[PDB]
Amino acid sequence: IESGIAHIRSTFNNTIVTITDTHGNAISWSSAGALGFRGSRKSTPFAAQMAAETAAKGSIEHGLKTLEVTVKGPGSGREAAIRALQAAGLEV
Amino acid sequence: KEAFMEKLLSFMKEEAYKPLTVQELEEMLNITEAEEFKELVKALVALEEKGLIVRTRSDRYGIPEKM
């Protein structure tokens, strides 16, 4: 499938990135915690960035191209995590 | 996991090595699969925790001795 949503949940503790089809079926996901970041690091935008990349590169295998993005939560990740989706190749 | 960490450390120990970002390490190691990228991130975190590598303020990884 080509088109999909990137659900970014940036909390103060963690940044999760799920990528789904339009029907909200999960394609792939990654989180700061899933990349082995711990404590302060998970909060940081860099971790959000890397989480977005890992979630994205999982999606590109299934063959995505365009992403709608949804952001939740007050974390600092959303700006970094979205750039990372653009940087991974998927158009926002 | 350990063989991958050793290989990454060996690469960073080379005399020509300059501090690289995660993306520059991905490119230089020819990592193309999302599972290998996950291994790289886990290895960087584990090596940074052990103090065998250091992340700079510009998100570049380097060897402590060379810095």
Swiss-Prot record, chain A:
Any Gene Ontology biological process: translation
GO molecular-function terms, A-Z: rRNA binding; structural constituent of ribosome
Sorted UniProt keywords: Ribonucleoprotein, Ribosomal protein, RNA-binding, rRNA-binding
Keyword rRNA-binding: yes
Record's keyword annotation contains Ligase: no
A GO CC annotation given for this chain: cytosolic small ribosomal subunit
Described function: Located on the platform of the 30S subunit, it bridges several disparate RNA helices of the 16S rRNA. Forms part of the Shine-Dalgarno cleft in the 70S ribosome.
Subunit structure: Part of the 30S ribosomal subunit. Interacts with proteins S7 and S18. Binds to IF-3. Interacts with VmlR. Interacts with BrxC.
Family from the record: Belongs to the universal ribosomal protein uS11 family.
Protein name: Small ribosomal subunit protein uS11
Organism: Bacillus subtilis (strain 168)
Shown part of the complete sequence: 18 to 109 of 131
Swiss-Prot record, chain B:
Phenotype of null mutants: No visible phenotype. Increased half-life of type I toxin-antitoxin system RNAs of BsrG/SR4.
Location of the protein in the cell: Cytoplasm
Highest taxon of the lineage: Bacteria
Disulphide bonds in the chain: none
Annotated transmembrane regions: none
Induction (UniProt): Constitutively expressed, part of a 5 gene operon with multiple promoters. Not ethanol-stress induced.
Task of the protein: 3'-5' exoribonuclease that releases 5'-nucleoside monophosphates and is involved in maturation of structured RNAs. Involved in degradation of type I toxin-antitoxin system bsrG/SR4 RNAs.
Homology family: Belongs to the RNR ribonuclease family. RNase R subfamily.
Protein name, as recorded: Ribonuclease R
Taxonomic placement: Bacteria, Bacillati, Bacillota, Bacilli, Bacillales
Section covered of the full-length record: 3 to 69 of 779
